[PDB]
Amino acid sequence: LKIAAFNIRTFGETKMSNATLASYIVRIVRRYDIVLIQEVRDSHLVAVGKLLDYLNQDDPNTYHYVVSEPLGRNSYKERYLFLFRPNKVSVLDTYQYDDGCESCGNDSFSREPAVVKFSSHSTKVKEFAIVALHSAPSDAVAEINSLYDVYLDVQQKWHLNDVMLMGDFNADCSYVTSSQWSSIRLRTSSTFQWLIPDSADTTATSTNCAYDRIVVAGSLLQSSVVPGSAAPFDFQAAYGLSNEMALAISDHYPVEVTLT
Amino acid sequence: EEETTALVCDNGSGLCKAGFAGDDAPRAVFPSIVGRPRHQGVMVGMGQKDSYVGDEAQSKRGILTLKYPIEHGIITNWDDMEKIWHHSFYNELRVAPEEHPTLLTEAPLNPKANREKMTQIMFETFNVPAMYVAIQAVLSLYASGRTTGIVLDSGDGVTHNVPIYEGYALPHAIMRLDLAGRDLTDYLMKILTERGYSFVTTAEREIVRDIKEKLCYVALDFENEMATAASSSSLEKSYELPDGQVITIGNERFRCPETLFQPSFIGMESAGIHETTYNSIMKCDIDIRKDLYANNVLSGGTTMYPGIADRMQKEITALAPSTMKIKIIAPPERKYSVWIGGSILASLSTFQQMWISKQEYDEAGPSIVHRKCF
Ligand SMILES: *[C@@H]1O[C@H](CO)[C@@H](O[C@@H]2O[C@H](CO)[C@@H](O[C@@H]3O[C@H](CO[C@H]4O[C@H](CO)[C@@H](O)[C@H](O[C@@H]5O[C@H](CO)[C@@H](O)[C@H](O)[C@@H]5O)[C@@H]4O)[C@@H](O)[C@H](O[C@@H]4O[C@H](CO[C@H]5O[C@H](CO)[C@@H](O)[C@H](O)[C@@H]5O)[C@@H](O)[C@H](O)[C@@H]4O)[C@@H]3O)[C@H](O)[C@H]2NC(C)=O)[C@H](O)[C@H]1NC(C)=O
Ligand SMILES: Nc1ncnc2c1ncn2[C@@H]1O[C@H](COP(=O)(O)OP(=O)(O)OP(=O)(O)O)[C@@H](O)[C@H]1O
Ligand SMILES: [Ca+2]
Ligand SMILES: [Ca+2]
């Protein structure tokens, strides 16, 4: 299976109306069997719909979707989008993290995580949850630490140890310094393997920051990842793009991994 | 002792209004659209939903093929109308249709057959105990506490003039002007896009309707207004787009509803509201006419604009024979008048007699047999 987490900047109508930018997104989304698209600011799911119109064009089932509601603590709001190939995997259950109270998701996260239970019939792990997080860069250390209590919650709900956590964690540069990694349970505990290292560059910008990360917990899931497959995919280098053109698609790179 | 509660549904081209007999306002107001998922998938706390109706359909419209089942007051697609009625009882109203008498409203000059397919879905599919179907405009008038007047009712997809005398609409003096709310919102989007503003996204286009409802108004004398705006700034108002960038319109504000008086502005070679009202009254019997000019009631969402009442007053007076006491009555709650009407009637114990029950339906339902005044 090949899965990515891509933060596509201001994914929305305008963006998806521009046929050159849409072509590119389509070419990038098609590499993956499960891709998480963050920063979906699409009030009426028009751009998600247009994207899907592109993907499902000659087989109405090349991709199915899972999408949350606008999330954010009453401000700018964005959606989490999971698109998958239903012939490769299946979503058994989904939920949006909250704590034990309805306002409560938002006490620990600005865009409270969506977690999805997949069945994979092609890989050694046969069942696993993906939890998505796009952190709010000023709250990044705290959120990525709270992501550990969401791993706990998925184990208590779904009796699932195999948990892949991924997204634009803002987990580098000025939002998370070397010294602050000791405050992040998610990283401190040996339960978790960080597949995108700190040296990576996952920003399309001239910054060198491992903003976007993929974490895997559970020994079965840790055994399914193909070693050396987790990387940012640099579409600018891949499709021989100019700077301008590459940033028009996004200021981030998809971070992908392969499971077997 | 509380009597078993009837429901009132008013299914308009843009909005369904629904609720309980006795209340002052529809407990439910949602748009009249049905949407089917263009693609398979799921919302995060949710099971795959096969269809959406109302707010939900418009919130997610980007991934649905939307359907509008009521075209200009008339039910056009009966399958999607079942989805709506269905939604109204079980989701919105939270009732079991089997134990509540439902009163439904209909358009002026609604096809005899349609009223019947409506009677049949209620009884056959919704198994309503007893049910009534009233004409939208009569309900607005009775809601004014009266049984004689002429009504202008202007919604989202149709506008009608309806003379009613002693409680029944006078069928061939009814005028139908195919111009209402949606046309005005589109005209305002026309105006503002000429002016270099763009409303391209769904969110952006959605808000035009709101500047419409907020800042548009009817000039008592279009021509003078037009001069005021050319020389001042007093008529100008701004509005913040959802994206923080602002909008500032000034003459636009009375230009868009002016379409109701001068359909010229949207290329609609047809007559305007004031004259449609006049012409209906002239098809009436010359004795009731005095009463019509004095009980000229306004009804509907497009009837909302500030100023509109004064221009109907003025325009009909310069057209009406010099001794007629013209009275334009515009109720504060008039965007809900039909529903309110429907509630008020359904509440009277008297009305329990006119209510057709499924028992009567063992003996078929012909209902309409349409009629006179010309
Ligand atoms: C959809 O989404 C896309 C992306 O978001 C949108 O596209 C961008 O939109 C802007 C504005 O509309 C475009 O700008 C016009 O194009 C030229 C600007 O680019 C020039 O800049 C330098 C040289 O100055 C150079 O880098 C460019 O060449 C390319 O570089 C890349 C990277 O190295 C290479 O891979 C490519 O192969 C190219 O070689 C390019 O030359 C300008 O033409 C234009 O300005 C006008 O130019 C007129 C002509 O005069 C001279 O201008 C320059 C300098 O000498 C030169 O280009 C030209 O040959 C002439 O010698 C002049 O008379 C006018 O007065 C004016 O100055 C615009 O700036 C931009 O390129 C689009 N592409 C990208 C990738 O961003 C798109 O609009 C969206 N919308 C829709 C509906 O699709
Ligand atoms: N304050 C306002 N000023 C102007 N337009 C308004 C105002 N309030 C509501 N509207 C408009 O009224 C229209 C909806 O009115 P209404 O509910 O009477 O129509 P409807 O019953 O859906 O359709 P129809 O009666 O035409 O079949 C919409 O165009 C809405 O924008
Ligand atoms: Ca970079
Ligand atoms: Ca109506």
Residue boundaries of the structural domains of chain B: 5-33+70-133+336-370, 34-67, 135-180+270-331, 181-266
Q: Which amino acid is at B172?
A: H
Q: With contact defined as beta carbons under 8 Å apart, do B73 and B13 qualify?
A: yes
Residue B53 CA, ligand 2 centroid: distance in Å: 19
How many domains in chain A?
A: 1
**Do B45 and A12 count as a contact with CB atoms less than 8 A apart?**
no
3-class DSSP string for chain B: CCCCCCEEEEECCCEEEEEECCCCCCCEEEECCEEEECCCEEECCCCCCCCEECHHHHHCHHHEEEECCEECCEECCHHHHHHHHHHHHHHHHCCCHHHCCEEEEECCCCCHHHHHHHHHHHHHHCCCCEEEEEEHHHHHHHHCCCCCEEEEEECCCCEEEEEEECCEECHHHCEEECCCHHHHHHHHHHHHHHCCCCCCCHHHHHHHHHHHHHHCCCCCCHHHHHHHHHHCCCCCEEEECCCCCEEEECCHHHHHHHCCCCHHHHCCCCCCHHHHHHHHHHHCCCCCHHHHHHCEEEECCCCCCCCHHHHHHHHHHCCCCCCCCCCEECCCCCCCHHHHHHHHHHHCHHHHHCCEEHHHHHCCCCCCCCCCCC
Q: Specify the resolution in Å.
A: 1.8
CATH topology for the B135-180+270-331 domain: Nucleotidyltransferase; domain 5 (3.30.420)
Distance CA B66, CA B68 (A): 7
Q: Do domains B5-33+70-133+336-370 and B135-180+270-331 have the same CATH topology?
A: yes
Residue A224, SS3 per DSSP: helix
Query: Is the C-alpha dihedral spanning A15, A17, A21, A24 positive or negative?
Result: positive
Q: Please name which of B103, B114, B109 lies closest in space to residue B169, comparing C-alpha atoms.
A: B109
Q: Which residues pair with B71 in a beta bridge?
A: B74
Q: For position A48, which CATH number holds?
A: 3.60.10.10
- Please tell me what DSSP assigns to residue A73: S
Query: What does A131-179 look like in DSSP terms, one character per residue?
Result: EE----GGGHHHHHHHHHHHHHHHHHHH----EEEEEE---SGGGS-GG
**Do A65 and B202 count as a contact with CB atoms less than 8 A apart?**
no
Residue A219, SS3 per DSSP: helix
Distance CA A158, CA A129 (A): 9
| A128 phi/psi in degrees, rounded to 5 | -165, 155
And the tokens for A120? 């994979």
B306: left (phi over 0), alpha (psi -120 to 50) or beta: beta
Residue A51, SS3 per DSSP: helix
And the tokens for A54? 């592109």
Q: For chain A, how long is the longest CA-to-CA vector?
A: 51
Q: Atom 2, ligand 2: which residue's CA is nearest?
A: B213
Residue A234, SS3 per DSSP: coil
Sorted by sequence, the CB contacts under 8 Å of residue A148 that are 6+ apart come out as A184, A185, A186, A189
* Among candidates B40, B59, B60 on the partner chain, residue whose Cβ is nearest the Cβ of A64: B40
Q: Ligand 2, from B156, B185, B260: best to mutate by most atoms within 8 Å of Cβ?
A: B156
- The angle formed by the CA atoms of residues A200, A205 and A207, to the nearest 5 degrees, is 55
Report the structure determination method. Answer: X-ray
Write the CATH number of the domain with boundaries B5-33+70-133+336-370.
3.30.420.40
Q: Which amino acid is at B295?
A: N
| Closest CA of chain A from B57, distance in Å | 9
Domain around A161 = 1-260
**Ligand 2 proximal residues by C-beta, below 6 Å:** B 12-15, 73, 155-158, 180-182, 209, 212-213, 300-302, 304-305, 335
CATH topology for the B34-67 domain: Actin; Chain A, domain 2 (2.30.36)
Sheet containing B64-67, strands listed edge to edge, beginning at the edge strand earlier in sequence:
B52-53, B34-37, B64-67
Residue in the block written with tokens 């290292």: A197
Q: For chain B, how long is the longest CA-to-CA vector?
A: 69
Q: Let me know if domain B181-266 sits in CATH 3.90.640.10.
A: yes
Residue A26, SS3 per DSSP: helix
Please state, as a whole number, how many other Cβ atoms lie within 10 Å of the Cβ of residue A248: 17
Cβ-based burial of B111 (10 A; exposed 0-12, middle 13-18, buried ≥19): middle
And the tokens for A123? 């890989």
3-state helix, strand and coil shares in percent for chain A, rounded to the nearest 5: 30, 30, 40
Residue B300 CA, ligand 4 centroid: distance in Å: 6
